[PDB]
């Protein structure tokens, strides 16, 4: 249940907040899409657009992100890819 | 097998090329990250930045895309999410 960061380009503060918002999301939604949605929407509001979120157990991805705005982590069996573009 | 498009906001021409590139990727690569990376990079080159690609069997996603530049499709058991941002 303790989040495990697998890769990142991010400040500790923003990272902690993303992890916090993500754990909270898990208490509230059963579908991966909806978990991703609430995290994405919250970050857009709190930090400005444009965020993108993928939540799942099986995927590969190649994306482009604004410097300092990328984190990839697990909570339990669930992987989270969270990043920002313009 | 034959790609199955499950969501789209994209022109036929661009769609067909994404599908073709994705099918070609599957003849060469099995790892989801490899498949995603080659599609993403080819689209960046051919259609301009910035593209993002997710390939997998289990994920939920919530993203923002330029209008006319979004397609989500399966080829066999693999789901492809392909989209462009600023």
């Amino acid at each position: 249940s303790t989040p495990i960061v697998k890769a990142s380009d991010i400040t500790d503060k923003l990272k902690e907040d993303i992890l916090t918002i993500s754990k909270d999301a898990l208490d509230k939604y059963q579908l991966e899409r909806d978990i991703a949605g609430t995290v994405k929407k919250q970050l857009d509001v709190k930090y400005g657009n444009t965020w993108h979120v993928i939540v799942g157990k099986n995927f590969g991805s190649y994306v482009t992100h604004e410097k300092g705005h990328f984190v990839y982590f697990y909570i339990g069996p669930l992987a989270f890819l969270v990043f920002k573009t313009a | 097998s034959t790609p199955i498009v499950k969501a789209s906001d994209i022109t036929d021409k661009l769609k067909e090329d994404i599908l073709t590139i994705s099918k070609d990727a599957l003849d060469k690569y099995q790892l989801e990250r490899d498949i995603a990376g080659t599609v993403k990079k080819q689209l960046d080159v051919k259609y301009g930045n910035t593209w993002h690609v997710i390939v997998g069997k289990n994920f939920g996603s919530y993203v923002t895309h330029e209008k006319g530049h979004f397609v989500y499709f399966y080829i066999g058991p693999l789901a492809f999410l392909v989209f462009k941002t600023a």
Partner: peptide, 10 residues
């Protein structure tokens, strides 16, 4: 901008 490729463990 910077690029990131990732792959889930499972």
């Amino acid at each position: 901008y910077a690029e990131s490729g990732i792959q889930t463990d499972l």
